[PDB]
């Protein structure tokens, strides 16, 4: 009859679709462009601002803003433009008619959840909605009731252990390393080889280079010695104008910064050693079952060899006699959406929704008690 909308705000991609189907039918970058140059021609259809695939198409003349930085929504009018575009232009469905399910990272400020509810009820008039933790949804997607989720998109990285369907909130970790701040580093190392990508439009090109050519070394010192000692490792890529650029050790050297955040000047350990510290914060009965399932989720885990590097150094840190297993389905970029698509369709979930009546009675406050 009526089937929930499932929308994942993320950073970078918005991905959205109807509950109970196989893959998101709208996916596009969450990016708002405003034109910065003087417009010369008259009678043009020239437009206030552009969203998503429009802004990618015209990006040479636009300034591009991301309205979400480290899973926190920083600008609200931009975000409303992105949601408006999602429902009317991408899905072409009136939000009065469909419950909505919205996704978020853990330990981010409560004002984010409050204002994200207030906008959905008051401007869209969505009849009911819910806000869900990204990591939880990856287990629904991967068919497990137990595991430690390692999740990284653009923006926030976080670990959440889950055991038999119970969360373990004191062990949750959050890390700001992933995905954007890899690219902002890749621009600086490419400057060392004599290319300068400064503008916000050039950043999208560096992001595409990162998606195509980077990979994680099994041993970081062996491959730096090798690529110092050869050109065998070295690959060249064609910029949008037809120039060609050649990239050597920089291509493995960039995603290594996930495992040694001191490269960009962070304090914390890398993803393997927050994963291990997260399992260490759990009680000793469960640990054998957390080591047996590590579910990797979100796009920044897509680099080739990131699973095998994870398995190798966690096996170095772990006690010798337990199997470490890393689970990394090729789907994983969409896991959070697929998990939400399953969850929003369960019959047992239909009592969970915040309904408009409860909001009208109790105000934006309700979200914190009812959700998570």
């Amino acid at each position: 009859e009526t089937t929930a909308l499932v929308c994942d705000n993320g950073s970078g991609l918005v991905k959205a679709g109807f509950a109970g189907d196989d893959a998101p039918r709208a996916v596009f970058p969450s990016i708002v462009g405003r034109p910065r140059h003087q417009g010369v021609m008259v009678g043009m259809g020239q437009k206030d601002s552009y969203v998503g695939d429009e802004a990618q198409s015209k990006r040479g003349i636009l300034t591009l803003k991301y309205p979400i930085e480290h899973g926190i929504i920083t600008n609200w009018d931009d975000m409303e433009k992105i949601w408006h575009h999602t429902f009317y232009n991408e899905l072409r469905v009136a939000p009065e008619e469909h419950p909505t399910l919205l996704t978020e990272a853990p330990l981010n400020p409560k004002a984010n959840r409050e204002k994200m509810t207030q906008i959905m009820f008051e401007t869209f008039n969505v009849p009911a909605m819910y806000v869900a933790i990204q990591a939880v949804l990856s287990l629904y997607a991967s068919g497990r009731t137990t595991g430690i989720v390692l999740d990284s998109g653009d923006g926030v990285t976080h670990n959440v252990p889950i055991y038999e369907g119970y969360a373990l909130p004191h062990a949750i970790m959050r890390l700001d390393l992933a995905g954007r701040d890899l690219t902002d580093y890749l621009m600086k190392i490419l400057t060392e080889r004599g290319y300068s990508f400064v503008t916000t439009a050039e950043r999208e090109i560096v992001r595409d280079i990162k998606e195509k050519l980077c990979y994680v070394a099994l041993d970081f010192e062996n491959e730096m010695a090798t690529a110092a000692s050869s050109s065998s490792l070295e690959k060249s890529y064609e910029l949008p104008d037809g120039q060609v650029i050649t990239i050597g050790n920089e291509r493995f050297r960039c995603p290594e910064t996930l495992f040694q955040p001191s490269f960009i000047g962070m304090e914390s350990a890398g993803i393997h050693e927050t994963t291990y510290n997260s399992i260490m914060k759990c009680d000793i009965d469960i640990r054998k079952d957390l080591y047996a399932n590590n579910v990797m989720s979100g796009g920044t885990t897509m680099y080739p060899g990131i699973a095998d590097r994870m398995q190798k150094e966690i096996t170095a840190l772990a006690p010798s006699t337990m199997k470490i297993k890393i689970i990394a389905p090729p789907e994983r970029k969409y896991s959070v959406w697929i998990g939400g698509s399953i969850l929003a369709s369960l019959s047992t979930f239909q009592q969970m929704w915040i309904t408009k009546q409860e909001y009208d009675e109790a105000g934006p406050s309700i979200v914190h008690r009812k959700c998570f």
């Binding site: 930085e69 480290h70 926190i72 920083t74 400020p109 700001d176």
Partner: peptide, 7 residues
């Protein structure tokens, strides 16, 4: 964010 960070 609000303090310990730019967002």
């Amino acid at each position: 964010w609000x303090a310990x960070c730019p967002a």
